[PDB]
């Protein structure tokens, strides 16, 4: 009830040994009242790393998108060695969304690394289970034999009426993920542990399907964008092996389902001037002229019989002199071109100084057209080249025309494919013009360049008209245990890709949310523009390029930081060699680098001084020493993980404050939230995500089960809590409900259409639905569109959430009237109470807690000691936690080494790994999340609590309590003990 105190463990272990003589009764009582629960103390066991590999394919569904709905791929297993290093060889195949499925090595929810089906963004199948949201549903496949070393998994996805289906060795798997989220780009993905070999069969030249695709399902190999080639890559990698060493990688650049839609500028509503008519005639003439030249150049014969089969030119006259449909076919060229031109800020010239008259007509007798003439009015330009503004205008117009035509095809019902077929309404150029390959770009822009250069020959006026916050920069800093407070240190940073990869030194308390140099906890240099960064940005040095290495050095004796580039010291604007000076030693300094999107940098701290280039040029004679010169093990780093994880509200938060008001009488013990700086400076209005620290856990067995009636209250299985929304706070901004421990969405302007949901429809071989259970990571009322919300009134809206831990329902009520939300969950689900609020008032929300008639308060659910206590209370464990966007995460010392390569045109791409790798994972029981045991090197509170837990274990098994020792062998096993022995970090 009072939280994790390291002194209560001291009390417990002092309760065990009486001045050299142990008391068996107390030792057994501790081991029977604390250990069996596995809920208070931190559990730990060894697990394997899980790595996921995807093809370079992204398919998505959107309104008016240029991509097909049906896709189908497969993976064949070649060799699996199960139970290498005493753990089941994880192997799952499925789809995954491009926004949300970003598994990182180590950590993860529950136990072990996260693979396909570990969260609601991905949906997997390991052979006999359908994995989704870290919950396995046993599927009734005809084989039910896992993924054997000889096995085939064919996976298909129909994005319209969303469904994902699997087929093992041709047998239909009796289970389908349905009605999932379409907000993103699905990609094929295989998650695996060490010791597997599989071949990715995408179809076509990239492998051959051993089973036919279902009717209407296109092969996945033809979804490759024309700008790229097929390749196997990790999902989201912050590290990649290189020649000199590991290369840190920033956040990847990813597309979106709205990027495959064309959105051209409407030009039919654009009015036309008489200038359009005046210029359009001669522009159409010149179009005919350049074309006649091409007709002469091509086999196209000069035959006025108008027969395309005999390659005959229809017009065959210098003046266009055509029938009406041909004439307007020539003129609407210029008509639509000038409409798109004037839709922008561009005007139209009127033959300034008779420039068209000045420009002459140079006829060439060699290109004589038998019918048109010796030369069909060549209209040679007067060496008027295309202005760069004009060329950008051409590409702009080319993009517009391509988008218009693609929109037409899409409205007709066309889809993009790498191969082209006409009957199935498929095109290889239907992708938007930004995603187009350069050749078709040239083919589209050639005629437009000719038109623009003709207009420039005439007198014409020339005038022109991933990336989310906390997901754009990856911060790699040295571990907090390597802080330097004295001496001369030097470390290098190679810039493999030019851009924003700010490099320098930083304080140990570098906040990962704030960018480097925007605060006082960083001293960095941004070589994208050369600008140094400390509490602002100032000009310095010079911009870098590819291959440039920055040898950042610090002098604690001289209180300076100096940046050198390629062996020469970078000087400031004033000419001072030192970039920063008078730098207080303070707590210490750490090497740090913040890489941007699609950015690659090689951070060489100096473990190999021979590998430290330019160190002899700068640093060796100056007295500077390589960072970690004599260190044997490599320096561990901490990347700024972007996973949104709930953490407690700081007591000194500059804007939000949590007040712990006492229950008193006619009021329940409640946690009220207030906005300190509301209606003043720094009055930010952002979507705040809040939850209570303790979860309520549904019963494992789902049985049918004024004055407070004692027998009803003794047999009560339901629990109640409520949230008060004050008069100032708009009810359209509060979202009252529950969240699973797998909620990691920090998107602003949250709405119930942005929740993660999936219905795992399990069925029978005949087709009858076995079950249609639903899975979601959060269950809230639609407070934004609440009938209770529907006019600003002084009343306060109280929303109660009656949850039956036995039945499984979570019925909501608003102001006594029962709401029509009846979310029903599966057994053994933990559900933290939560509200998401957009602050519109100083008094925003209040977690009232408490109880009603014949209902427990929520404290009875959270706390087992107060299970039968009907008095509402707020023990110090209960607190309000706000969602953090990013947090520090330890980079694993060794990563799973995966080799991906194509064997041939028949076999195709193959993924292989054979190097076993294990980590010890510390698992928080209430939050259902685990991290490295090595990660406790900076989390000192968890370090101390776990150390005193180990001390309690030793004290309770001490003095020959062999029964307790046997009991403790389950919590701490031989493999864990030996790995902790051999673990140097």
């Amino acid at each position, epitope marked *: 009830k009072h939280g994790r105190n390291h002194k209560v463990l001291d009390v417990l272990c002092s309760l065990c040994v009486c001045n050299g003589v142990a008391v068996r009764s107390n030792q057994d009582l501790i081991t029977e009242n604390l250990l069996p629960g596995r809920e208070l103390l931190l559990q730990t066991n060894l697990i394997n790393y899980v790595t996921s590999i995807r093809p370079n394919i992204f398919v998505g569904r959107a309104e008016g998108s240029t991509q097909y709905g049906k896709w189908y791929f497969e993976v064949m297993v070649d060799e699996v060695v199960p139970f290498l290093t005493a753990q089941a060889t994880h192997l799952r195949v499925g789809w995954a969304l491009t926004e949300g499925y970003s598994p990182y090595p180590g950590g993860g929810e529950g136990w072990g690394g996260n693979g396909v089906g570990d969260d609601l963004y991905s949906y997997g199948f390991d052979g006999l289970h359908l994995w989704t949201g870290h919950v396995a549903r046993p599927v009734t496949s005809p084989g039910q034999h896992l993924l054997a070393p000889e096995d085939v998994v064919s996976c298909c996805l129909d994005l319209s009426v969303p469904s994902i289906s699997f087929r093992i060795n041709g047998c239909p798997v009796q289970g389908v993920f349905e009605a999932f989220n379409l907000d993103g780009l699905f990609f094929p993905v295989v998650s695996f542990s060490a010791g597997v070999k599989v071949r990715f069969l995408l179809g076509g030249r990239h492998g051959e399907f051993k089973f036919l695709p279902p009717p209407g399902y296109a092969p996945c190999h033809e979804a490759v964008l024309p700008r790229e080639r097929l390749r196997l890559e990790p999902i989201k990698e912050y590290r990649r092996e290189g020649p000199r060493g590991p290369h840190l990688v920033g956040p990847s650049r990813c597309l979106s389902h709205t990027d495959f839609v064309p959105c051209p500028v409407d030009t039919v509503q654009i009015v036309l001037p008489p200038h359009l008519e005046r210029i359009r005639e001669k522009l159409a003439e010149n179009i*005919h002229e350049l*074309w006649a030249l091409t007709r002469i150049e091509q086999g196209w014969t000069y035959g006025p019989v108008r*027969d395309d*089969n005999k390659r*005959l030119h229809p017009c065959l006259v210098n003046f266009h002199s055509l029938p009406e449909p041909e004439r307007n*076919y020539n003129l609407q060229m210029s008509g639509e071109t000038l409409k798109t031109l004037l839709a922008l800020g561009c005007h139209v010239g009127m033959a300034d100084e008779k420039a068209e008259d000045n420009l002459k007509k140079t006829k060439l007798p060699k290109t004589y057209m038998m019918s048109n003439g010796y030369k069909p009015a060549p209209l040679d330009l007067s060496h008027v080249r295309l202005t760069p503004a004009q060329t950008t205008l051409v590409d702009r117009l080319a993009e517009n025309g391509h988008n218009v035509w693609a929109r*037409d095809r899409v409205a007709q019902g066309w889809s993009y494919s790498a191969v082209q077929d006409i009957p199935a309404r498929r*095109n290889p150029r239907l992708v938007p013009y930004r995603l187009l390959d350069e050749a078709t770009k040239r083919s589209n822009r050639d005629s437009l360049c000719q038109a623009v250069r003709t207009l420039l020959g005439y007198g014409y006026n020339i005038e022109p008209p991933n990336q989310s916050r906390w997901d754009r920069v990856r911060i790699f800093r040295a571990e907090k245990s390597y802080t330097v407070q004295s001496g001369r240190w030097y470390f290098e940073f190679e810039a493999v890709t030019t851009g924003e990869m700010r490099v320098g030194w930083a304080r140990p308390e570098l906040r990962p949310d704030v960018e480097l140099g925007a605060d006082e906890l960083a001293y960095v240099f941004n070589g994208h523009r050369g600008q140094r960064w400390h509490l602002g940005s100032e000009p310095f040095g010079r911009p870098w390029q590819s291959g440039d290495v920055v040898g950042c050095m610090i002098d604690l004796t001289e209180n300076t930081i100096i940046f050198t580039l390629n062996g020469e010291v970078l000087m400031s604007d004033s000419g001072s060699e030192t970039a920063f000076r008078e730098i207080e030693i303070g707590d210490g300094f750490l090497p740090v680098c913040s890489l941007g999107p699609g950015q690659v940098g090689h951070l060489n701290l100096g473990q190999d001084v021979s590998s430290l280039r330019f160190f002899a040029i700068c640093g060796l004679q100056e007295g500077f020493e390589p960072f970690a010169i004599n260190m044997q093990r490599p320096v561990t780093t901490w990347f700024s993980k972007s996973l949104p994880q709930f953490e407690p509200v700081p007591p000194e938060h500059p804007h939000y404050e949590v007040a712990r008001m006492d229950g008193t009488v006619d009021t329940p013990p409640c946690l009220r939230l207030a906005h300190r700086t509301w209606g003043s400076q720094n009055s930010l209005v952002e979507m705040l995500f809040l939850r209570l620290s303790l979860p309520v856990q549904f019963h494992q067995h789902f049985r049918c089960t004024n004055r407070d009636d004692p027998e009803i209250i003794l047999n009560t299985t339901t629990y109640y809590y409520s949230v008060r929304v004050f008069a100032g706070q708009e009810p359209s901004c509060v979202w009252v409900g529950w969240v699973t421990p797998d909620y990691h969405q920090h998107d602003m302007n949250f709405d119930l259409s942005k929740v993660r949901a999936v219905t795992v429809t399990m069925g029978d071989e005949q087709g009858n639905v076995h079950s249609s259970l639903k899975c979601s990571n959060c269950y809230m009322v639609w407070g934004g569109d609440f009938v209770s919300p529907g006019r600003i009134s002084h009343t306060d809206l109280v929303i109660g959430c009656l949850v039956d831990l036995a039945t499984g329902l979570m019925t909501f009520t608003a102001n006594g009237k029962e709401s029509n939300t009846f979310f029903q969950v599966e057994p053994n689900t933990k559900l933290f109470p939560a509200v998401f609020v957009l602050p519109t008032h100083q008094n925003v929300i209040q977690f009232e807690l408490g109880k009603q008639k014949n209902i427990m308060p929520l404290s009875a659910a959270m706390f087992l000691s107060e299970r039968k206590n009907p008095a509402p209370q707020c023990p110090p464990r209960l607190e309000v936690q706000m969602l953090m966007p990013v947090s520090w995460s330890r980079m694993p010392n060794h990563f799973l080494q995966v080799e991906t390569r194509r064997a041939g045109e028949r076999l195709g791409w193959a993924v292989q790994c054979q190097d076993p790798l294990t980590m010890m994972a510390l698992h928080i029981p209430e939050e259902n999340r685990c991290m490295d045991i090595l990660e406790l090197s900076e989390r000192l509170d968890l370090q101390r609590f776990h150390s005193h837990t180990l001390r309690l274990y030793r004290a309770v098994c001490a003095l020959g309590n062999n029964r307790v020792a046997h009991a403790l062998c389950s919590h701490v096993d031989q493999a864990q003990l030996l790995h902790a022995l051999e673990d140097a970090h």
Partner: nanobody
Amino acid sequence: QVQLQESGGGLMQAGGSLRLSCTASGSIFSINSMGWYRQAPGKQRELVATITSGNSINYADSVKGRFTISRDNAKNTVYLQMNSLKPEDTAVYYCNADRVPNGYNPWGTPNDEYDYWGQGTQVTVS
């Protein structure tokens, strides 16, 4: 936008007149030409004598036989008259309403790629 349907099939001896009616309901954007293509069983689809708005005549590679193809623009309907018949003429005929006319492509690639297809109809010859 422009939905066009081709109808008219029959079986009779060589020399039987055949009226093939293709109706294009929609905008006049695709009125520029009414192309016709025949898919013979096991043979590359090949081109028919095509008319552009105003009934411009242009004989094609498979123009063998009497291709009396005409069309009205009031309801955008094109009728092809196969007066002659040959055993090799047995094929599925498809009509397309497209804004590119016959052998007339000065436009860009997208404007050359505007094309609307149709159902088509199998025609057999005794």
